Short mmCIF file of N, CA and C in Angstrom, two decimals:
data_model
loop_
_atom_site.label_atom_id
_atom_site.label_comp_id
_atom_site.label_asym_id
_atom_site.label_seq_id
_atom_site.Cartn_x
_atom_site.Cartn_y
_atom_site.Cartn_z
N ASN A 1 -18.98 -21.62 -171.03
CA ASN A 1 -17.51 -22.27 -171.28
C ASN A 1 -16.92 -21.64 -172.65
N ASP A 2 -17.69 -21.57 -173.55
CA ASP A 2 -16.95 -21.02 -174.95
C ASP A 2 -16.75 -19.64 -174.67
N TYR A 3 -16.34 -19.15 -173.57
CA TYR A 3 -16.17 -17.60 -173.25
C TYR A 3 -14.92 -17.39 -172.85
N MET A 4 -14.70 -16.73 -171.96
CA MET A 4 -13.38 -16.29 -171.48
C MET A 4 -12.80 -17.50 -170.84
N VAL A 5 -11.25 -17.62 -170.91
CA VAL A 5 -10.47 -18.86 -170.36
C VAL A 5 -9.80 -18.34 -169.08
N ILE A 6 -10.05 -19.05 -167.89
CA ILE A 6 -9.45 -18.46 -166.55
C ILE A 6 -8.04 -19.16 -166.90
N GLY A 7 -7.01 -18.26 -167.07
CA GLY A 7 -5.61 -19.26 -167.08
C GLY A 7 -5.35 -19.42 -165.78
N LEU A 8 -5.63 -18.69 -164.63
CA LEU A 8 -5.30 -18.90 -163.47
C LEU A 8 -5.94 -18.16 -162.31
N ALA A 9 -6.28 -18.65 -161.26
CA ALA A 9 -7.04 -17.81 -160.10
C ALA A 9 -6.08 -17.70 -158.91
N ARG A 10 -5.38 -16.63 -158.78
CA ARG A 10 -4.53 -16.43 -157.51
C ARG A 10 -5.12 -15.67 -156.37
N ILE A 11 -5.20 -16.10 -155.37
CA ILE A 11 -5.59 -15.26 -154.11
C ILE A 11 -4.54 -14.75 -153.52
N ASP A 12 -4.61 -13.35 -153.18
CA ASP A 12 -3.52 -12.65 -152.59
C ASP A 12 -3.90 -11.17 -152.10
N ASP A 13 -3.81 -11.15 -150.80
CA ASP A 13 -4.45 -9.77 -150.11
C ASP A 13 -3.33 -8.56 -150.66
N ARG A 14 -2.25 -9.00 -151.27
CA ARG A 14 -1.51 -7.77 -151.68
C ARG A 14 -1.66 -7.63 -153.09
N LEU A 15 -2.43 -8.52 -153.92
CA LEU A 15 -2.66 -8.21 -155.27
C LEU A 15 -1.39 -8.49 -156.20
N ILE A 16 -0.59 -7.27 -156.32
CA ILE A 16 0.82 -7.34 -157.08
C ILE A 16 1.86 -7.14 -156.24
N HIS A 17 2.69 -8.03 -155.97
CA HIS A 17 3.88 -7.67 -154.86
C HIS A 17 5.17 -8.39 -155.45
N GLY A 18 6.27 -7.74 -155.15
CA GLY A 18 7.54 -8.32 -155.67
C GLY A 18 7.50 -8.96 -157.08
N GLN A 19 8.26 -9.93 -157.57
CA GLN A 19 8.12 -10.28 -158.84
C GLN A 19 7.31 -11.29 -159.23
N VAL A 20 6.28 -11.51 -158.05
CA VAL A 20 5.35 -12.77 -158.01
C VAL A 20 4.51 -12.35 -159.39
N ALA A 21 3.98 -11.22 -159.54
CA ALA A 21 3.06 -11.02 -160.73
C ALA A 21 3.81 -11.09 -161.94
N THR A 22 5.01 -10.61 -161.81
CA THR A 22 5.96 -10.71 -163.22
C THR A 22 6.24 -12.08 -163.58
N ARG A 23 6.76 -12.75 -162.61
CA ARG A 23 7.19 -14.34 -162.92
C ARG A 23 5.64 -14.96 -163.44
N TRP A 24 4.86 -14.90 -162.56
CA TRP A 24 3.66 -15.76 -162.87
C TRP A 24 3.03 -15.28 -164.10
N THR A 25 3.10 -14.08 -164.49
CA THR A 25 2.47 -13.51 -165.68
C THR A 25 3.17 -14.32 -166.91
N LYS A 26 4.29 -14.19 -167.01
CA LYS A 26 5.24 -14.75 -167.95
C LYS A 26 5.01 -16.47 -167.95
N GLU A 27 4.93 -17.04 -167.02
CA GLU A 27 4.74 -18.51 -166.89
C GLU A 27 3.48 -18.87 -167.09
N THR A 28 2.48 -17.91 -166.75
CA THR A 28 0.90 -18.12 -166.94
C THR A 28 0.58 -17.83 -168.52
N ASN A 29 1.46 -17.14 -169.10
CA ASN A 29 1.29 -16.55 -170.46
C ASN A 29 -0.02 -15.64 -170.30
N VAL A 30 0.10 -14.83 -169.47
CA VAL A 30 -1.16 -13.87 -169.43
C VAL A 30 -0.87 -12.69 -169.64
N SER A 31 -1.80 -12.05 -170.63
CA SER A 31 -1.77 -10.48 -171.09
C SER A 31 -2.63 -9.73 -170.45
N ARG A 32 -3.28 -10.33 -169.64
CA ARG A 32 -4.57 -9.50 -169.11
C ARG A 32 -4.67 -10.09 -167.38
N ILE A 33 -4.83 -8.99 -166.64
CA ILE A 33 -5.12 -9.30 -165.31
C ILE A 33 -6.29 -8.53 -164.68
N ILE A 34 -7.36 -9.23 -164.18
CA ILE A 34 -8.58 -8.40 -163.61
C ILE A 34 -8.30 -8.61 -162.08
N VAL A 35 -8.43 -7.59 -161.33
CA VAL A 35 -8.56 -7.48 -159.83
C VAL A 35 -10.12 -7.49 -159.58
N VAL A 36 -10.39 -8.36 -158.53
CA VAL A 36 -12.00 -8.26 -158.08
C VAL A 36 -12.00 -7.99 -156.65
N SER A 37 -12.29 -6.82 -156.23
CA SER A 37 -12.32 -6.53 -154.91
C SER A 37 -13.15 -5.10 -154.83
N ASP A 38 -14.27 -4.93 -153.89
CA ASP A 38 -15.04 -4.02 -153.88
C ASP A 38 -14.27 -2.84 -153.08
N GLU A 39 -13.44 -3.38 -152.12
CA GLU A 39 -12.80 -2.28 -151.19
C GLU A 39 -11.70 -1.54 -152.16
N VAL A 40 -10.83 -2.29 -152.88
CA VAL A 40 -9.88 -1.79 -153.67
C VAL A 40 -10.61 -0.84 -154.69
N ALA A 41 -11.68 -1.29 -155.39
CA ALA A 41 -12.48 -0.49 -156.45
C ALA A 41 -12.92 0.74 -155.81
N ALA A 42 -12.92 0.80 -154.47
CA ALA A 42 -13.55 2.04 -154.09
C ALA A 42 -12.28 3.07 -153.64
N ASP A 43 -11.13 2.49 -153.94
CA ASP A 43 -9.90 3.28 -153.74
C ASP A 43 -9.49 3.78 -155.13
N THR A 44 -9.76 5.10 -155.51
CA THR A 44 -9.10 5.53 -156.81
C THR A 44 -7.65 5.92 -156.68
N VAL A 45 -7.12 6.19 -155.63
CA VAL A 45 -5.56 6.36 -155.37
C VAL A 45 -4.83 5.06 -155.55
N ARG A 46 -5.48 3.91 -155.15
CA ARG A 46 -4.62 2.75 -155.29
C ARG A 46 -4.88 2.27 -156.62
N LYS A 47 -6.17 2.25 -157.53
CA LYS A 47 -6.04 1.89 -158.71
C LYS A 47 -5.22 2.54 -159.76
N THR A 48 -5.15 3.89 -159.32
CA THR A 48 -4.17 4.58 -160.30
C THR A 48 -2.75 4.13 -160.26
N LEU A 49 -2.21 3.92 -158.85
CA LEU A 49 -1.03 3.25 -158.81
C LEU A 49 -0.84 1.79 -159.42
N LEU A 50 -1.81 1.02 -159.31
CA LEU A 50 -1.82 -0.48 -159.85
C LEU A 50 -1.89 -0.42 -161.38
N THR A 51 -2.58 0.69 -161.78
CA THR A 51 -2.69 0.87 -163.24
C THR A 51 -1.41 1.26 -163.81
N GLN A 52 -0.79 2.23 -163.08
CA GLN A 52 0.26 2.84 -163.64
C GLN A 52 1.75 2.05 -163.48
N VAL A 53 1.43 0.99 -162.75
CA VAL A 53 2.69 -0.04 -162.34
C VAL A 53 2.45 -1.23 -163.02
N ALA A 54 1.43 -1.34 -164.11
CA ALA A 54 1.10 -2.64 -164.81
C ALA A 54 2.16 -3.06 -165.53
N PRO A 55 2.86 -4.34 -165.48
CA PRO A 55 4.00 -4.70 -166.20
C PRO A 55 3.79 -4.48 -167.52
N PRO A 56 4.91 -4.13 -168.44
CA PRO A 56 4.76 -3.96 -169.80
C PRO A 56 4.07 -4.90 -170.54
N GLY A 57 3.30 -4.45 -171.52
CA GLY A 57 2.54 -5.59 -172.25
C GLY A 57 1.40 -6.13 -171.69
N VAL A 58 1.54 -5.68 -170.43
CA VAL A 58 0.27 -6.62 -169.52
C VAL A 58 -0.76 -5.62 -169.01
N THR A 59 -1.94 -5.85 -169.10
CA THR A 59 -3.15 -4.68 -168.68
C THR A 59 -3.57 -5.20 -167.49
N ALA A 60 -3.75 -4.37 -166.36
CA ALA A 60 -4.42 -4.63 -165.22
C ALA A 60 -5.74 -3.87 -165.08
N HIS A 61 -6.53 -4.61 -164.52
CA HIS A 61 -7.93 -3.88 -164.61
C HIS A 61 -8.53 -4.13 -163.17
N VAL A 62 -9.29 -3.18 -162.76
CA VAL A 62 -9.94 -3.33 -161.30
C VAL A 62 -11.51 -3.18 -161.47
N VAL A 63 -12.03 -4.36 -161.12
CA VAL A 63 -13.61 -4.30 -161.15
C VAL A 63 -14.29 -4.84 -159.84
N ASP A 64 -15.52 -4.85 -159.58
CA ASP A 64 -16.30 -5.52 -158.42
C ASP A 64 -16.70 -6.84 -158.69
N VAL A 65 -17.08 -7.43 -157.74
CA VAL A 65 -17.72 -8.90 -157.93
C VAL A 65 -18.88 -8.81 -158.97
N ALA A 66 -19.65 -7.73 -158.75
CA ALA A 66 -21.08 -7.84 -159.69
C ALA A 66 -20.48 -7.45 -161.07
N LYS A 67 -19.52 -6.59 -161.31
CA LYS A 67 -19.18 -6.15 -162.46
C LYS A 67 -18.19 -7.34 -163.13
N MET A 68 -17.58 -8.04 -162.34
CA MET A 68 -16.61 -9.01 -162.83
C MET A 68 -17.63 -10.21 -163.54
N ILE A 69 -18.51 -10.58 -162.83
CA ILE A 69 -19.49 -11.48 -163.54
C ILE A 69 -19.91 -10.98 -164.84
N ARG A 70 -20.18 -9.79 -164.98
CA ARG A 70 -20.60 -9.22 -166.33
C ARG A 70 -19.50 -9.38 -167.42
N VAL A 71 -18.46 -9.00 -166.94
CA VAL A 71 -17.23 -9.04 -167.95
C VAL A 71 -17.07 -10.51 -168.31
N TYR A 72 -17.16 -11.34 -167.74
CA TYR A 72 -17.29 -12.79 -167.91
C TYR A 72 -18.28 -13.06 -168.87
N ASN A 73 -19.52 -12.47 -168.81
CA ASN A 73 -20.55 -12.93 -169.51
C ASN A 73 -20.59 -12.38 -170.93
N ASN A 74 -19.41 -11.60 -171.24
CA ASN A 74 -19.19 -11.04 -172.63
C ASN A 74 -18.23 -11.83 -173.44
N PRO A 75 -18.87 -12.46 -174.52
CA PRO A 75 -17.85 -13.36 -175.46
C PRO A 75 -16.82 -12.32 -175.88
N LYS A 76 -16.83 -11.13 -175.72
CA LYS A 76 -15.77 -10.20 -176.23
C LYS A 76 -14.47 -10.78 -175.73
N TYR A 77 -14.28 -11.42 -174.73
CA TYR A 77 -13.05 -12.14 -174.16
C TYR A 77 -12.94 -13.35 -174.55
N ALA A 78 -13.71 -13.95 -175.23
CA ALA A 78 -13.80 -15.43 -175.55
C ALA A 78 -12.40 -15.89 -175.86
N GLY A 79 -11.76 -17.14 -175.38
CA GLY A 79 -10.51 -17.55 -175.67
C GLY A 79 -9.39 -16.75 -174.88
N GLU A 80 -9.76 -15.39 -174.85
CA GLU A 80 -8.74 -14.57 -173.95
C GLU A 80 -8.28 -15.26 -172.91
N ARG A 81 -6.97 -15.20 -172.29
CA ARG A 81 -6.77 -15.71 -171.18
C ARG A 81 -6.39 -14.52 -170.10
N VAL A 82 -7.31 -14.79 -169.23
CA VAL A 82 -7.22 -13.85 -168.05
C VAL A 82 -6.89 -14.26 -166.75
N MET A 83 -6.14 -13.72 -165.96
CA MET A 83 -5.61 -14.15 -164.44
C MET A 83 -6.75 -13.27 -163.46
N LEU A 84 -7.22 -14.17 -162.67
CA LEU A 84 -8.07 -13.52 -161.54
C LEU A 84 -7.44 -13.33 -160.16
N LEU A 85 -7.69 -12.11 -159.82
CA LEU A 85 -6.84 -11.92 -158.30
C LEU A 85 -7.77 -11.38 -157.46
N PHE A 86 -7.72 -12.33 -156.43
CA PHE A 86 -8.67 -12.25 -155.26
C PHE A 86 -8.08 -11.90 -153.79
N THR A 87 -8.68 -11.53 -152.97
CA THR A 87 -7.99 -11.19 -151.59
C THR A 87 -8.64 -12.06 -150.68
N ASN A 88 -9.75 -12.72 -150.90
CA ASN A 88 -10.47 -13.61 -149.88
C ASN A 88 -11.31 -14.73 -150.64
N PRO A 89 -11.24 -16.07 -150.31
CA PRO A 89 -11.73 -17.22 -151.22
C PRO A 89 -13.32 -16.87 -151.14
N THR A 90 -13.75 -16.12 -150.21
CA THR A 90 -15.29 -15.84 -150.05
C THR A 90 -15.80 -15.40 -151.47
N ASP A 91 -14.89 -14.22 -152.19
CA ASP A 91 -15.37 -13.73 -153.33
C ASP A 91 -15.14 -14.60 -154.48
N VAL A 92 -14.43 -15.88 -154.40
CA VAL A 92 -14.22 -16.61 -155.29
C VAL A 92 -15.64 -17.77 -155.43
N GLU A 93 -16.16 -17.92 -154.30
CA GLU A 93 -17.33 -18.77 -154.26
C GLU A 93 -18.45 -18.01 -154.89
N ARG A 94 -18.54 -16.61 -154.78
CA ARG A 94 -19.49 -15.76 -155.10
C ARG A 94 -19.55 -15.81 -156.72
N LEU A 95 -18.23 -16.05 -157.26
CA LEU A 95 -18.32 -15.84 -158.76
C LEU A 95 -18.83 -17.31 -159.14
N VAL A 96 -18.40 -18.29 -158.50
CA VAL A 96 -18.96 -19.63 -158.90
C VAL A 96 -20.26 -19.62 -158.84
N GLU A 97 -21.06 -19.20 -157.86
CA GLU A 97 -22.36 -19.15 -157.79
C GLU A 97 -23.18 -18.52 -158.81
N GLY A 98 -22.45 -17.63 -159.47
CA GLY A 98 -23.04 -16.65 -160.49
C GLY A 98 -22.92 -17.64 -161.70
N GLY A 99 -22.30 -18.75 -161.82
CA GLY A 99 -22.24 -19.69 -162.95
C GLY A 99 -20.70 -19.62 -163.51
N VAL A 100 -19.82 -18.89 -162.74
CA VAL A 100 -18.31 -18.77 -163.36
C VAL A 100 -17.67 -20.31 -163.18
N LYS A 101 -17.17 -20.68 -164.06
CA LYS A 101 -16.57 -22.03 -163.97
C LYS A 101 -15.08 -22.04 -163.63
N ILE A 102 -14.74 -22.64 -162.45
CA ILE A 102 -13.51 -22.65 -161.76
C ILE A 102 -13.02 -24.06 -161.63
N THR A 103 -11.72 -24.41 -162.27
CA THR A 103 -11.45 -25.91 -162.07
C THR A 103 -10.50 -25.86 -160.78
N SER A 104 -9.79 -24.96 -160.57
CA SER A 104 -8.70 -25.16 -159.28
C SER A 104 -8.48 -23.64 -159.02
N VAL A 105 -8.23 -23.35 -157.50
CA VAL A 105 -7.85 -22.36 -156.91
C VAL A 105 -6.44 -22.27 -156.38
N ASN A 106 -5.59 -21.20 -156.77
CA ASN A 106 -4.28 -21.33 -156.10
C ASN A 106 -4.07 -20.21 -154.96
N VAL A 107 -3.60 -20.47 -153.80
CA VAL A 107 -3.48 -19.76 -152.78
C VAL A 107 -2.07 -18.91 -152.82
N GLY A 108 -1.92 -17.83 -153.13
CA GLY A 108 -0.62 -17.01 -153.11
C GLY A 108 -0.19 -16.73 -152.03
N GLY A 109 -0.84 -15.86 -151.31
CA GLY A 109 -0.63 -15.40 -149.86
C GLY A 109 -1.83 -14.67 -149.20
N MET A 110 -1.64 -14.72 -147.85
CA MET A 110 -2.70 -14.26 -146.94
C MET A 110 -2.16 -13.55 -145.79
N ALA A 111 -2.14 -11.99 -145.79
CA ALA A 111 -1.70 -11.53 -144.53
C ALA A 111 -2.28 -12.12 -143.29
N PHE A 112 -1.29 -12.37 -142.50
CA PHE A 112 -1.74 -13.18 -141.12
C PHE A 112 -2.57 -12.11 -140.10
N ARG A 113 -3.21 -12.48 -139.16
CA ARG A 113 -4.08 -11.54 -138.43
C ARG A 113 -4.32 -12.28 -137.00
N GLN A 114 -4.52 -11.47 -136.11
CA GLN A 114 -4.91 -12.21 -134.67
C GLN A 114 -6.24 -12.95 -134.88
N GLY A 115 -6.49 -14.07 -134.33
CA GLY A 115 -7.79 -14.76 -134.44
C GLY A 115 -7.57 -15.77 -135.42
N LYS A 116 -6.71 -15.78 -136.40
CA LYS A 116 -6.59 -16.54 -137.46
C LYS A 116 -5.51 -17.71 -137.28
N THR A 117 -5.64 -18.88 -137.91
CA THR A 117 -4.71 -20.01 -137.55
C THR A 117 -3.43 -19.90 -138.85
N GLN A 118 -2.25 -20.00 -138.51
CA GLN A 118 -1.41 -20.08 -139.74
C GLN A 118 -1.32 -21.40 -140.30
N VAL A 119 -1.61 -21.45 -141.57
CA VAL A 119 -1.47 -22.77 -142.19
C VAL A 119 -0.22 -22.97 -143.03
N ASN A 120 0.43 -21.84 -143.42
CA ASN A 120 1.64 -21.87 -144.29
C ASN A 120 2.67 -20.61 -143.70
N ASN A 121 3.59 -20.63 -144.36
CA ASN A 121 4.65 -19.36 -143.98
C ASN A 121 4.15 -17.99 -144.01
N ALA A 122 2.99 -17.89 -144.96
CA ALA A 122 2.51 -16.52 -145.14
C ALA A 122 0.98 -16.66 -145.51
N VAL A 123 0.40 -17.90 -145.10
CA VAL A 123 -1.18 -18.14 -145.80
C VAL A 123 -1.86 -18.38 -144.22
N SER A 124 -2.76 -17.54 -144.17
CA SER A 124 -3.66 -17.47 -142.79
C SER A 124 -5.03 -18.02 -143.15
N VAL A 125 -5.80 -18.45 -142.25
CA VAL A 125 -7.29 -18.81 -142.52
C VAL A 125 -8.05 -18.73 -141.39
N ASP A 126 -9.20 -18.29 -141.66
CA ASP A 126 -10.25 -17.99 -140.49
C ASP A 126 -11.33 -19.00 -140.51
N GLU A 127 -12.26 -19.22 -139.82
CA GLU A 127 -13.33 -20.35 -139.88
C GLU A 127 -14.01 -19.81 -141.13
N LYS A 128 -13.99 -18.56 -141.56
CA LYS A 128 -14.82 -18.43 -142.79
C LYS A 128 -14.08 -18.90 -144.08
N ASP A 129 -12.73 -18.49 -144.15
CA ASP A 129 -11.97 -18.85 -145.40
C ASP A 129 -11.77 -20.52 -145.22
N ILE A 130 -11.70 -20.93 -144.35
CA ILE A 130 -11.87 -22.65 -144.30
C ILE A 130 -13.24 -22.94 -144.90
N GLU A 131 -14.15 -22.36 -144.39
CA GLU A 131 -15.58 -22.81 -145.02
C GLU A 131 -15.45 -22.53 -146.35
N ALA A 132 -14.97 -21.55 -147.07
CA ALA A 132 -15.07 -21.41 -148.40
C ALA A 132 -14.31 -22.39 -149.19
N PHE A 133 -13.10 -22.72 -148.84
CA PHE A 133 -12.33 -23.78 -149.19
C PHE A 133 -12.94 -25.16 -149.32
N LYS A 134 -13.63 -25.55 -148.08
CA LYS A 134 -14.17 -26.76 -148.04
C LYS A 134 -15.45 -26.95 -149.21
N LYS A 135 -16.16 -25.78 -149.56
CA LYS A 135 -17.16 -26.03 -150.63
C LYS A 135 -16.75 -26.13 -151.76
N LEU A 136 -15.61 -25.33 -152.21
CA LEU A 136 -15.09 -25.56 -153.64
C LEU A 136 -14.65 -27.00 -153.76
N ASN A 137 -13.92 -27.60 -152.74
CA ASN A 137 -13.45 -29.05 -152.66
C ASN A 137 -14.66 -29.90 -152.99
N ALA A 138 -15.77 -29.37 -151.97
CA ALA A 138 -17.10 -30.38 -152.30
C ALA A 138 -17.55 -30.37 -153.81
N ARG A 139 -17.28 -29.27 -154.52
CA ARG A 139 -17.56 -29.33 -155.93
C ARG A 139 -16.77 -29.95 -157.00
N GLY A 140 -15.70 -30.53 -156.36
CA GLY A 140 -14.82 -31.09 -157.11
C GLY A 140 -13.54 -30.25 -157.51
N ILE A 141 -13.38 -28.99 -156.89
CA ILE A 141 -12.53 -28.00 -157.45
C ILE A 141 -11.22 -28.28 -156.72
N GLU A 142 -9.97 -28.22 -157.42
CA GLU A 142 -8.88 -28.52 -156.66
C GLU A 142 -8.35 -27.25 -155.81
N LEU A 143 -7.66 -27.59 -154.94
CA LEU A 143 -7.11 -26.22 -154.11
C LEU A 143 -5.77 -26.55 -153.74
N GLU A 144 -5.01 -25.70 -154.46
CA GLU A 144 -3.44 -25.86 -154.05
C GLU A 144 -2.85 -24.50 -153.57
N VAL A 145 -1.96 -24.85 -152.44
CA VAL A 145 -1.27 -23.76 -151.74
C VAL A 145 0.25 -23.51 -152.26
N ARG A 146 0.59 -22.71 -152.59
CA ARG A 146 1.94 -22.24 -153.07
C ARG A 146 2.44 -20.89 -153.31
N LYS A 147 3.59 -20.56 -152.89
CA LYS A 147 3.92 -18.96 -152.96
C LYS A 147 4.43 -18.84 -154.39
N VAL A 148 5.35 -19.68 -154.82
CA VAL A 148 5.81 -19.60 -156.17
C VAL A 148 5.59 -20.83 -157.12
N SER A 149 5.72 -20.77 -158.34
CA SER A 149 5.60 -21.98 -159.02
C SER A 149 6.62 -22.80 -158.87
N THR A 150 7.80 -22.18 -158.40
CA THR A 150 9.26 -23.16 -158.10
C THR A 150 8.92 -23.89 -156.90
N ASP A 151 8.08 -23.49 -156.03
CA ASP A 151 8.12 -24.32 -154.65
C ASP A 151 7.19 -25.31 -154.70
N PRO A 152 7.40 -26.57 -153.90
CA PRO A 152 6.36 -27.64 -154.00
C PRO A 152 4.99 -27.17 -153.74
N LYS A 153 4.19 -27.87 -154.44
CA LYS A 153 2.68 -27.79 -154.18
C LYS A 153 1.97 -28.38 -152.91
N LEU A 154 1.52 -27.68 -152.20
CA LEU A 154 0.79 -28.38 -151.01
C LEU A 154 -0.62 -28.54 -151.15
N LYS A 155 -1.47 -29.37 -150.64
CA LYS A 155 -3.06 -29.23 -150.89
C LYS A 155 -3.66 -28.56 -149.84
N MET A 156 -4.49 -27.61 -150.11
CA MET A 156 -5.10 -26.86 -148.95
C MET A 156 -5.77 -27.61 -147.88
N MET A 157 -6.47 -28.48 -148.27
CA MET A 157 -7.03 -29.52 -147.61
C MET A 157 -6.28 -30.19 -146.60
N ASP A 158 -5.11 -30.57 -147.14
CA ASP A 158 -4.06 -31.31 -146.18
C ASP A 158 -3.65 -30.30 -145.20
N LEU A 159 -3.38 -29.10 -145.45
CA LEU A 159 -2.89 -28.15 -144.47
C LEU A 159 -3.87 -27.95 -143.31
N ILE A 160 -5.41 -27.89 -144.00
CA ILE A 160 -6.28 -27.54 -142.91
C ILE A 160 -6.63 -28.86 -142.21
N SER A 161 -6.45 -30.02 -142.85
CA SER A 161 -6.76 -31.38 -142.20
C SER A 161 -5.88 -31.65 -140.90
N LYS A 162 -4.66 -31.05 -140.99
CA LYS A 162 -3.64 -31.08 -139.88
C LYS A 162 -3.91 -30.08 -138.70
N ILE A 163 -4.81 -29.11 -139.02
CA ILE A 163 -5.12 -28.30 -138.17
C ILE A 163 -6.51 -28.48 -137.68
N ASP A 164 -7.67 -28.49 -138.51
CA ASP A 164 -8.76 -28.76 -138.15
C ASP A 164 -9.01 -30.19 -138.46
N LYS A 165 -9.86 -30.70 -137.62
CA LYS A 165 -9.78 -32.30 -137.74
C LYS A 165 -10.87 -32.82 -136.79
#
C-alpha cells in the first residue's frame, strides 16, 4: 500500500485514442502511463509508435502482466501516480490476485464484436468480461462505465443487470 499509487485504471482495447488520453492525463494529474498487454508487448512496431507519440511531459511504458506486478512491487515508484491501461478486465483480476490493490475500475471503451452484447455506445462484454466484472464487485471494488469524465457515470452492474438477469 505504501508503494505506487494507482491514479486511475482505464480499460480500452485502443490504449491511446483521440484526446481521451490527453484530457484524462491532465485531469488525472498523471505524468506516467503503463500499458499492460502481452499481445502489444510482443509488437515492437506498435510499441515504437506509442512511445514516439507519448504526450509531452508524459511517459508511456509497455509491460506484460507478469512484469507489471514486479514494477508495482518496487517502492521506486512509491507515491508516484501511474495510470493503468488494460484491454480486457481479465488482466485486471490477474493483477488483483497478485496482491495489487484496486479500489475502482473505469471502462473507457471496448471494440464491439459478434457474439458479444452491446452494453453501451462503444462498450461490449462477453460472458468472460462479465464474469471478471462480477468478481471485482464481489470484492467491494467499484465498476463505473464512462467514455469521457464529462459524460454521466453509469454503473457496470446496472448495465449488465438490465441485460443479464
